[PDB]
Amino acid sequence: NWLGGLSRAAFPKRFVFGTVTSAYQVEGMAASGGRGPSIWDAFAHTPGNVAGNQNGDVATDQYHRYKEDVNLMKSLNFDAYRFSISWSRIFPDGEGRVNQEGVAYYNNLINYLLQKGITPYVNLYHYDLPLALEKKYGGWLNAKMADLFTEYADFCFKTFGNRVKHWFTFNQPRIVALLGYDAGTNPPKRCTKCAAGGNSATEPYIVAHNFLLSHAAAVARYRTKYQAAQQGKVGIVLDFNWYEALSNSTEDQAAAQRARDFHIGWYLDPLINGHYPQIMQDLVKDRLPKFTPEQARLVKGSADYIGINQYTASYMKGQQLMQQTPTSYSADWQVTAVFAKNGKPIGPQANSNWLYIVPWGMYGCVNYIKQKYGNPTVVITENGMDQPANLSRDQYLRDTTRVHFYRSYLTQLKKAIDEGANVAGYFAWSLLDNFEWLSGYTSKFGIVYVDFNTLERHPKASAYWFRDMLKH
Numbered sequence: 001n002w003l004g005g006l007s008r009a010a011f012p013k014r015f016v017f018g019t020v021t022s023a024y025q026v027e028g029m030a031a032s033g034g035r036g037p038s039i040w041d042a043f044a045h046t047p048g049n050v051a052g053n054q055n056g057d058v059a060t061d062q063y064h065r066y067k068e069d070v071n072l073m074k075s076l077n078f079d080a081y082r083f084s085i086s087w088s089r090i091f092p093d094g095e096g097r098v099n100q101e102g103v104a105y106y107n108n109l110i111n112y113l114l115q116k117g118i119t120p121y122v123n124l125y126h127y128d129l130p131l132a133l134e135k136k137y138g139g140w141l142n143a144k145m146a147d148l149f150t151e152y153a154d155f156c157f158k159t160f161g162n163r164v165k166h167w168f169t170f171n172q173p174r175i176v177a178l179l180g181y182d183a184g185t186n187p188p189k190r191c192t193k194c195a196a197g198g199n200s201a202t203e204p205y206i207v208a209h210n211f212l213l214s215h216a217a218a219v220a221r222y223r224t225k226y227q228a229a230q231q232g233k234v235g236i237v238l239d240f241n242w243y244e245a246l247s248n249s250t251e252d253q254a255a256a257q258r259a260r261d262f263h264i265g266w267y268l269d270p271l272i273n274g275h276y277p278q279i280m281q282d283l284v285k286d287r288l289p290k291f292t293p294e295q296a297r298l299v300k301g302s303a304d305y306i307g308i309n310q311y312t313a314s315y316m317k318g319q320q321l322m323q324q325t326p327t328s329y330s331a332d333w334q335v336t337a338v339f340a341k342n343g344k345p346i347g348p349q350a351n352s353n354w355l356y357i358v359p360w361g362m363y364g365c366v367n368y369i370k371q372k373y374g375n376p377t378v379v380i381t382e383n384g385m386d387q388p389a390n391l392s393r394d395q396y397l398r399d400t401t402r403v404h405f406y407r408s409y410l411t412q413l414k415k416a417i418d419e420g421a422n423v424a425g426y427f428a429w430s431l432l433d434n435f436e437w438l439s440g441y442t443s444k445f446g447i448v449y450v451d452f453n454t455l456e457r458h459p460k461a462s463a464y465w466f467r468d469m470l471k472h
C-alpha cells in the first residue's frame with residue numbers, strides 16, 4: 001500500500017505528529033507590524049547573498065494567513081505545529097522596549113492553534129538574531145548573550161507559557177557556528193578570509209559554547225521561576241546527519257565516530273554528560289572553551305528532550321591522526337566524507353546538493369543516540385526533502401519522490417522505536433514551501449505547495465499521504 005503499513009497504530013500511544021516552519025522563512029511582514037530587523041534581513045537585502053537577490057520580506061505571508069494554514073494542518077490530521085518566535089518582532093532592538101503588536105500576533109496564533117486542537121511546539125530562536133544585538137554586542141561571540149537570551153526567554157515564558165507547554169531554545173547551533181563563523185556563508189559572514197573579520201579555527205567554538213551557556217541559563221530561569229506553575233518543558237534542536245564508516249577498518253570506524261562526536265557530540269556530550277567529547281578536547285585543545293564545574297552542572301541535564309533534525313547520511317573515510325596547524329572547525333575533524341561505496345552512490349540527491357536520500361540514516365541516528373546517551377527523550381524536529389525551482393504547479397503537486405521519502409524514512413524511524421528508542425514525536429519540514437535561506441525560493445520543501453506570485457496554498461500528494469496515515 002502507498003502507506004506501506006504505516007498509520008498511528010504503527011507508532012507508540014500518544015506519539016506526536018506535526019509539521020514545522022520558522023519565523024523568517026514563512027511569516028513575512030519582516031519590516032512591518034513593528035518588527036525590528038534581524039541579521040537575516042540585513043544579509044538577504046544585500047545583493048548577491050541569496051539566490052535571485054530574494055528575501056523574506058513577504059515569504060508565505062503566514063502573518064496574515066495563519067488561520068488558513070492552521071485550518072490546513074488540522075484537515076491533514078496533524079497533532080502539533082513547530083514554529084518559531086521572531087526575537088526582533090517581540091523586542092525590535094533585542095532588549096528593552098516590547099512591540100505589543102508582535103506579542104499580539106503570537107497570542108493570536110497560539111490561541112487559534114489551541115482552539116483547533118493543535119499543540120504548539122515553540123522555538124525561541126531560529127537564526128534570526130536581532131540586528132541591534134549583533135551590532136551592539138557582537139552576537140554569539142559575546143558571553144553576554146546568555147543574559148540577553150535569558151531575558152527574552154523569560155518574557156516569552158511569562159507571556160505565553162500558561163498556554164505553551166513545549167519549548168525549544170535554539171535551532172541547529174552547529175550550522176550557525178559552521179556557516180556563520182567557519183565557512184562565513186551565513187550571517188554574520190565571519191571567517192578567516194572574510195570581509196567582516198573572523199577566525200574559522202576559534203570562533204565556531206566560542207559561538208557553540210555561548211549557545212550551550214545561553215540554553216542552560218534560559219532553562220535554569222524556566223525551572224526556578226515558571227515550571228512549578230506552568231508545568232511545561234524546554235529542549236533544544238540539533239542537526240544530526242548519519243555517518244557510516246566507509247569500510248570496517250579501524251581507521252574508517254574511528255573516522256565515522258570522530259565525525260559523530262564533532263557533529264552531534266559537540267552539543268549532546270555537554271547536555272547529557274556535562275563535558276565536551278574527549279576527541280574534541282584532545283584535538284581542539286586550547287581552542288575549545290572549558291566549562292567551569294558550576295557551568296558544566298548547569299548545562300548537564302538542561303534539556304527536557306532532544307530535538308533532532310535528521311535529513312541525510314554519508315560515509316566517512318579516515319587516516320592517521322596527525323599534528324596540524326589549526327585552520328578551521330571543519331578541518332579539525334581529520335576525516336573525509338564519501339558519498340559512494342562499492343561504486344554505488346549512498347542515495348540519490350534531492351534538489352539540495354547536501355541532501356542525499358538515505359532512509360537508513362534515520363535508523364542510524366536514532367539508534368546511535370539511544371545506545372550512546374542513555375536513551376534520552378528524542379523528538380524528530382525536522383525531516384523532509386526539496387523539489388527544484390521552475391516546475392509547474394501540477395509537477396509540484398505530484399510529489400511522488402517526497403511520498404516515497406516519508407514512507408521510507410518513517411519506516412526506518414518505526415524500526416528504531418520498535419527496538420526501544422525513546423522517540424516522542426516527529427515533525428515534517430516543512431508545512432509550506434518557503435524561504436530556504438541561501439536558496440531563497442528556488443528550493444521547495446513543503447508538503448503544501450505555495451504559489452509565490454499569488455501566495456495560494458495547494459496541498460501536494462505528500463500532504464494527502466500524511467492525512468491518510470494520520471487519520472484518528
Ligand SMILES: OC[C@H]1O[C@@H](O[C@H]2[C@H](O)[C@@H](O)[C@H](O[C@H]3[C@H](O)[C@@H](O)[C@H](O[C@H]4[C@H](O)[C@@H](O)[C@H](O)O[C@@H]4CO)O[C@@H]3CO)O[C@@H]2CO)[C@H](O)[C@@H](O)[C@@H]1O
Pocket residue numbers: 001002397398460461464465468
Ligand atoms: O484527493 C485530493 C487530491 O489527492 C491527491 O493525492 C492522491 C494521490 O495522488 C493518490 O495516489 C492517492 O491514492 C491512494 C488512496 O488515497 C488510498 O486509499 C489507497 O490506499 C489503498 C491501498 O493502495 C491498498 O494497498 C490498501 O490495502 O488499501 C487502501 C484502500 O483502502 O492508495 C492510493 C495510492 O495508491 O490518494 C491521494 C489523496 O486522494 C491527488 O494527487 C489529487 O489529484 C487529488 O486532487
Ligand SMILES: OC[C@H]1O[C@@H](O[C@H]2[C@H](O)[C@@H](O)[C@H](O[C@H]3[C@H](O)[C@@H](O)[C@H](O[C@H]4[C@H](O)[C@@H](O)[C@H](O)O[C@@H]4CO)O[C@@H]3CO)O[C@@H]2CO)[C@H](O)[C@@H](O)[C@@H]1O
Pocket residue numbers: 022025171172175178239240241309311312314330333335336337354382429436437445
Ligand atoms: O535546509 C532545510 C532546512 O534544514 C535545516 O538546515 C539545513 C541547512 O539548510 C543546510 O545548510 C545543512 O547542510 C549541511 C549538511 O546537512 C551536512 O550533511 C554537511 O555536513 C558535513 C560536515 O559539516 C563536514 O564537516 C563533514 O566533513 O562532511 C559532512 C557531509 O558533507 O554540512 C552541510 C553544511 O555545510 O543542513 C541543515 C540540516 O542538517 C534548517 O533548520 C531549516 O530552517 C532549513 O530550511
Ligand SMILES: [Zn+2]
Pocket residue numbers: 061064
Ligand atoms: Zn499579507
